[PDB]
Structures are given as structure tokens and as C-alpha cells.
Amino acid sequence: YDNREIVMKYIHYKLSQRGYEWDAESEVVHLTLRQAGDDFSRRYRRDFAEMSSQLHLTPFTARGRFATVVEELFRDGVNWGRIVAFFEFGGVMCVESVNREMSPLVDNIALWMTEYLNRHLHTWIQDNGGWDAFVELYGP
């Protein structure tokens, strides 16, 4: 399961569902991930609304904000819920980027998400049943 295309497909979905357009077996993981995400965003929508209004994205601080939030998110543990939030947070930042016309920032966020998946979350995912475990937990 390629972590990059997991990111790419997810970000593209979340954006196109908000009205933006973006130049981007195994398909089950992608479908399950974005379904869990839409459910996550819906339930805590007011919260995500308050979070997006405090992001305060600038081209200078962007990568710092991503690094900081993500680090504190997994600072004291990793579970599938937090991994979903990690994708959803990435989505929030990508949406707030095109909201201010910083399209190139989306590609960078996509890069950062991918880099974080390979470097940190990957070992956890493998040692916790792989993505198949996630599908069994967030599917039917």
C-alpha cells in the first residue's frame, strides 16, 4: 500500500468535495479512509470550524503549523482515530490554502503528509495490523 497515493487520493477527494479542483484490493483502503474522514468531520464540525478559524495560514508559517500540530497529536500515543484526524487536519490545511489562493501549498502539505507517513506512522501501522486492520475497524 503506497502511502503517497493514499495521501494524494484523499486530498483530491476532500478538495473536490468542497468545490476546488486540484492537479493530483488497494482501492478499499482509500474508500474506507475518506468515509471515516467525512464521518469524523461531520460529527465534530463545529470544532473543525473553530480550528480552521485559528489556523491563520501564512506562506512563512505553514510548514511550522503542520509540524507542530501533528507532533502534539501523536506525542503521547497513536491510534487509528488520531490517524484519521491527521488526514482530516491535513485536509483542513489544504482547504484553507486554496481559500487564500496558495495552491502550491497544497502540494507541499501533500508532501509533508506523505513524508510523515513513511518516516513515523508507517512502523506503527505495520506493528498494529496494517491498513487491513483499519478497514476491519472502520468498514461495516
Binding site: 469524523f40 460529527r43 465534530y44 470544532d47 473553530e50 480550528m51 485559528q54 489556523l55 507542530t68 500540530v69 501533528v70 507532533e71 502534539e72 497529536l73 491510534n79 487509528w80 482515530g81 488520531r82 484519521v84 484526524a85 487536519f89 475497524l137 472502520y138
Partner: peptide, 19 residues
């Protein structure tokens, strides 16, 4: 008001519903 704190909190509520 803190972003990662709230995100982490609701993430765990979401996860506890799946056990």
C-alpha cells in the same frame, strides 16, 4: 482553544466508539 489538544481529544472519542 488550542488546536492539537482539541483535535487529539475528539480523535480519541472517535476511536473509543470503534472498540
Amino acid at each position: 482553544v488550542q488546536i492539537a489538544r482539541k483535535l487529539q481529544c475528539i480523535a480519541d472519542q472517535f476511536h473509543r466508539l470503534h472498540v
